[PDB]
Structures are given as structure tokens and as C-alpha cells.
Amino acid sequence: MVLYFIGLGLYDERDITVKGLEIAKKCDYVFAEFYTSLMAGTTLGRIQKLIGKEIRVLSREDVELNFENIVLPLAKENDVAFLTPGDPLVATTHAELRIRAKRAGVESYVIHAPSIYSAVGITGLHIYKFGKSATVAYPEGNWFPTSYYDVIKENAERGLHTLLFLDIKAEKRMYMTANEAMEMLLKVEDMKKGGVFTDDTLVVVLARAGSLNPTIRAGYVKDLIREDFGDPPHILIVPGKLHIVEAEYLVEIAGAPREILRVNV
Amino acid sequence: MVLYFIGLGLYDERDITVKGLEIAKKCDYVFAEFYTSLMAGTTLGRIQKLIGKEIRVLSREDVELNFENIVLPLAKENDVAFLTPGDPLVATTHAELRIRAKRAGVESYVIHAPSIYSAVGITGLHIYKFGKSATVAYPEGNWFPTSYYDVIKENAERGLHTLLFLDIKAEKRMYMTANEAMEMLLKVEDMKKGGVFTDDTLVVVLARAGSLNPTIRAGYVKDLIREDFGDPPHILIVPGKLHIVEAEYLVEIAGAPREILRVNV
Numbered sequence: 001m002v003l004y005f006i007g008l009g010l011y012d013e014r015d016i017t018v019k020g021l022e023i024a025k026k027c028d029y030v031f032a033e034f035y036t037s038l039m040a041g042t043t044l045g046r047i048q049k050l051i052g053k054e055i056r057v058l059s060r061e062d063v064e065l066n067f068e069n070i071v072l073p074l075a076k077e078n079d080v081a082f083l084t085p086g087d088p089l090v091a092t093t094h095a096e097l098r099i100r101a102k103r104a105g106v107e108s109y110v111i112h113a114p115s116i117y118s119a120v121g122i123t124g125l126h127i128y129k130f131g132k133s134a135t136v137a138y139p140e141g142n143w144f145p146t147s148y149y150d151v152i153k154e155n156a157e158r159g160l161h162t163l164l165f166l167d168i169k170a171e172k173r174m175y176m177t178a179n180e181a182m183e184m185l186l187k188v189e190d191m192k193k194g195g196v197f198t199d200d201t202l203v204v205v206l207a208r209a210g211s212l213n214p215t216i217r218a219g220y221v222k223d224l225i226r227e228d229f230g231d232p233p234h235i236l237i238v239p240g241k242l243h244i245v246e247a248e249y250l251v252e253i254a255g256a257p258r259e260i261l262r263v264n265v
Numbered sequence: 266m267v268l269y270f271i272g273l274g275l276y277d278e279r280d281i282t283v284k285g286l287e288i289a290k291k292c293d294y295v296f297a298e299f300y301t302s303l304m305a306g307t308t309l310g311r312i313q314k315l316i317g318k319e320i321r322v323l324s325r326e327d328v329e330l331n332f333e334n335i336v337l338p339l340a341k342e343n344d345v346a347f348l349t350p351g352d353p354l355v356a357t358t359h360a361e362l363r364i365r366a367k368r369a370g371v372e373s374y375v376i377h378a379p380s381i382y383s384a385v386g387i388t389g390l391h392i393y394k395f396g397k398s399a400t401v402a403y404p405e406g407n408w409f410p411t412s413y414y415d416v417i418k419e420n421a422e423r424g425l426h427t428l429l430f431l432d433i434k435a436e437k438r439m440y441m442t443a444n445e446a447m448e449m450l451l452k453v454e455d456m457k458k459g460g461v462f463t464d465d466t467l468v469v470v471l472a473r474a475g476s477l478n479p480t481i482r483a484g485y486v487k488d489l490i491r492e493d494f495g496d497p498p499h500i501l502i503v504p505g506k507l508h509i510v511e512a513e514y515l516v517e518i519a520g521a522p523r524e525i526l527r528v529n530v
């Protein structure tokens with residue numbers, strides 16, 4: 001009679017919470033999706049081994065089109081878990097799944113876990129100063145998306161930080177690097193010419209948040225665009241004007257150049 | 266000899282990640298603070314029991330003034346952990362402590378945990394649509410806070426949702442409720458009359474996120490301002506322009522007035 005939306009956290013199998021693991025262990029059926037994001041520091045086998053339950057992986061279509069014909073039916077006479085990377089209900093379309101549950105006369109509960117939305121706090125940037133968030137999407141055909149560029153503009157204009165998710169191709173396991181994102185932004189800048197993202201723009205790159213050894217780097221685009229940030233996934237952040245405390249952190253912890261203490265504060 | 270910043274999560278001791286528990290369990294000394302937020306579903310005893318260590322709780326003064334005199338020394342020749350509610354770096358100034366650690370020659374690591382900042386996803390509001398965040402502080406004498414009012418105005422003009430962190434004075438066991446924040450806001454409206462926060466303003470309240478049965482409510486100030494949302498902690502959210510699916514969720518899950526299903530654009 002119960003559906004549990006359980007988050008898996010950031011990087012590996014140990015990023016699930018104690019509450020999440022215990023609840024998952026008591027469930028008769030355990031489902032999961034890995035198309036919204038991937039746990040790059042682990043594998044399906046390691047997650048299954050930690051939970052002690054076989055995990056049935058669902059595709060994007062399984063969820064968005066058939067959640068009610070695949071997951072909810074079993075939840076009527078059993079305790080069912082639906083696992084997702086990060087924090088449940090963060091992916092835009094997931095909240096709607098709770099409505100589907102209600103409509104089916106199924107109780108659902110949410111077991112939280114760390115999300116990149118909060119983990120980016122490790123960059124030293126104040127959370128309250130983050131503005132609207134966006135995704136740098138992979139272009140294609142006659143479609144050249146530039147929305148994320150206006151998001152940066154509108155945020156930075158108000159002294160706000162911009163969190164940029166990088167596009168991902170789940171199955172093809174193709175991750176967009178911070179370098180690729182920077183390249184695209186430089187190209188959109190060439191068109192819009194709004195003076196929003198240039199070789200002199202300060203940016204922060206966070207890679208493998210959740211691991212014990214994340215890569216946190218900060219610097220001007222002209223110096224970081226070709227820097228190697230390690231294995232994915234990467235997250236790009238274009239900070240608004242910095243509070244001196246944020247800057248000192250970026251310098252001492254993320255290796256930022258002293259220059260930002262005078263230029264970006 | 267290293268220092269670990271470990272988050273404990275939203276509501277109780279089980280909201281800590283597995284990673285954090287295993288690491289915390291093997292630390293020589295364990296410190297913690299419970300002044301940046303309220304973990305309404307646990308006790309120091311339960312935490313100590315779960316970790317298998319004795320925890321020396323610190324005050325804001327001990328941390329802000331004597332962190333390097335109290336915690337860092339032990340870290341130079343031992344594995345030390347510093348626990349905090351939620352995520353250690355979110356909406357706190359704990360990030361600056363890492364700089365102190367470094368300047369003291371002490372390496373530090375961060376273990377994230379579910380944070381209220383990402384937990385807002387349970388309100389059905391698209392997490393990416395949130396703008397600048399704000400904090401509703403307690404009035405001090407003749408000094409009355411209003412900044413949080415401008416934040417809502419700026420976000421609303423852009424159609425972005427606003428997250429309002431509510432104040433806390435753990436030493437006085439004072440935890441600002443949503444109701445109280447709602448009234449402080451009406452007062453500001455009567456002073457600025459910007460048309461930002463009135464009795465017809467739609468709002469959302471999340472109380473005790475992290476528990477199995479948190480209080481999620483949405484509606485007009487006039488009908489919610491005197492409603493009981495249960496024990497703290499609470500957060501107040503003033504949505505911007507809603508999407509049809511956000512409205513459907515607020516109505517079906519947060520008991521909002523069925524008339525908000527009618528978006529104005």
C-alpha cells in the first residue's frame with residue numbers, strides 16, 4: 001500500500017541515507033531510474049549488493065508513460081521503493097509521479113538524500129545568492145538553444161550566481177564536460193554579444209560532488225577552458241559579484257587566482 | 266589527522282548518509298553544533314547512540330571564535346568530525362571554517378546530507394524556478410528587518426519562486442514559525458505598499474521536512490496566516506508564476522484552493 005521515493009545521493013552507493021537504506025531493505029519491490037542522472041562513483045551491482053534487493057531499472061518511457069502500469073500496481077499490496085540519483089522530486093517531472101500515486105489510491109513517502117543543488121555549497125558560494133537554474137543542452141539539427149545564456153545574464157545582473165547543469169545522454173553514457181559547456185557559451189556570446197560570458201568571465205567547476213575527493217576549480221574562462229577536470233559528471237557555475245568571504249574560499253580551496261580578490265569582489 | 270564536516274540531515278539521526286555514518290563511527294573525536302537548524306525528530310542521545318561516540322556540542326561562540334582553539338588542535342594528530350544539522354555548508358558560514366583548517370595545516374573533507382534547500386522539491390514547485398533566497402530574522406529592539414521583502418519582489422517580477430529561511434535562536438529555544446514570518450511580511454507590505462505580500466498572496470509552507478509525515482500546505486495568506494503547521498522547523502515559500510503541473514500538485518498534495526489550478530497566463 002506504500003510507495004517510497006528514495007534518493008541515492010550524489011556519487012556512490014554510500015550516498016543514500018541510513019533511513020533510505022533501511023526502508024529500501026524492507027520493501028518487497030525496488031525500482032530505480034538512471035536516465036535523469038548517473039552515479040559515476042558506483043555501479044548497479046554495488047547498489048544492489050548494499051541494499052540486498054534486486055533492482056529493476058526503468059527507462060524514461062517506463063516512468064513517464066507507464067509508471068502507473070508498472071510501479072503503482074505492485075504498491076497496492078506491497079511496499080515499493082523507487083530509487084533516483086540525488087534527492088527525490090528534484091527532477092522536474094518527478095513530483096507529478098506523486099499525483100499519479102494518489103490517483104491510484106497509493107500512499108507515498110519521500111526519503112531525502114543529498115542533491116547537487118545543495119552540495120554546490122562546497123564551492124564556498126553562498127546558497128542564498130543562487131538565482132534561476134538552467135541546463136546547457138546539446139544542440140542539434142536546426143535547433144540552437146540559448147536560453148541558459150539569458151538565465152546567466154538575468155542572474156548576474158542581479159548579483160546572483162548561476163548553477164548550470166550539463167547535458168547528458170544516459171544510455172550512450174555521454175557526458176558534456178565543463179570545457180564543452182564553456183565552448184558553447186563562448187559561441188552564444190559571439191551571437192548575443194551581450195557581454196555575459198567571455199574569456200575574462202570567472203567560473204567555478206565542480207566535478208564528482210559527493211566523493212571524498214571532488215574537483216573544485218575556479219578561474220577565468222581563458223585559463224580553465226582547456227583544463228582537465230577529471231571524470232564526469234561536471235557542473236558549471238557562473239558566479240555573480242562575490243562576497244569577499246566567497247572569494248577567499250575560492251582562492252584558498254579551489255585554487256582561484258588572487259586576481260579575483262580585486263576584480264570580482 | 267584530518268577534519269570531516271559531516272551533515273546529519275533534515276529531521277532525525279537516520280538522515281545522515283551511510284558514508285557519513287561509517288566515517289563518523291571511526292573518528293577519534295566528534296564535535297557538533299545544533300544552533301544553525303533544528304532536528305525536530307532526534308536527540309543528542311540518539312545521535313551518540315547511532316555513532317557510538319561521545320559528542321561534544323559546541324555553541325555559536327565556540328565555533329565562530331574558538332573553532333581553531335577547540336577543534337583544530339585535535340585534528341592535527343587525530344581524525345576529527347564536526348557534525349551539523351542538514352548539509353554543513355548550506356545557509357551557514359561553516360564554509361569559512363575550511364579556510365581556517367587549511368591555514369592550520371589541517372586537511373578537511375565534506376560529507377553532504379539532505380538539505381532543506383533541495384527538500385523544497387517535495388512542495389511540487391520546480392526546483393530550477395527558485396530565485397534568490399532570503400532569511401526572515403527576528404526583530405531586535407528598534408531595528409526591523411525588511412530585505413527579505415525586496416527579495417520576493419525581485420524574484421516575483423521574474424516569475425521565480427522564493428525560499429524563505431526562518432530564524433532560529435537555539436540557545437533560547439526560539440524557532441520562528443511560518444505564521445510569524447507571514448505576519449512580519451504583512452507588516453512590511455503596510456510600510457512599503459509595493460503590492461508584494463498581501464492577504465491574497467499564495468504561499469507554501471513546509472514543516473519538518475525529512476520526517477515521514479511533514480506538513481506541506483499551500484494557500485492564500487489570509488487563510489493560512491493563522492493555521493497551525495505543527496512543530497518547527499518551518500520554511501516559507503512565496504511562489505512566482507506557476508506551471509500547470511505545479512498548481513495541480515499544490516492542490517492535490519498541499520491542499521491548496523482548487524482555484525489556483527487556474528493560472529493567469
Ligand SMILES: Nc1ncnc2c1ncn2[C@@H]1O[C@H](CSCC[C@H](N)C(=O)O)[C@@H](O)[C@H]1O
Nearest residue numbers: 302351352355380381430431473474498499
Ligand atoms: N526539516 C526542515 N523543515 C522545514 N524547514 C527546515 C528544515 N530544516 C531546516 N529548515 C529551515 O532552515 C533553517 C536553518 S538554515 C540551515 C540549513 C541547513 N544547513 C540545511 O542544509 O538545511 C531553519 O530555521 C528552517 O527555516
Ligand code: NA
Nearest residue numbers: 130131133395
Ligand atoms: Na536555487
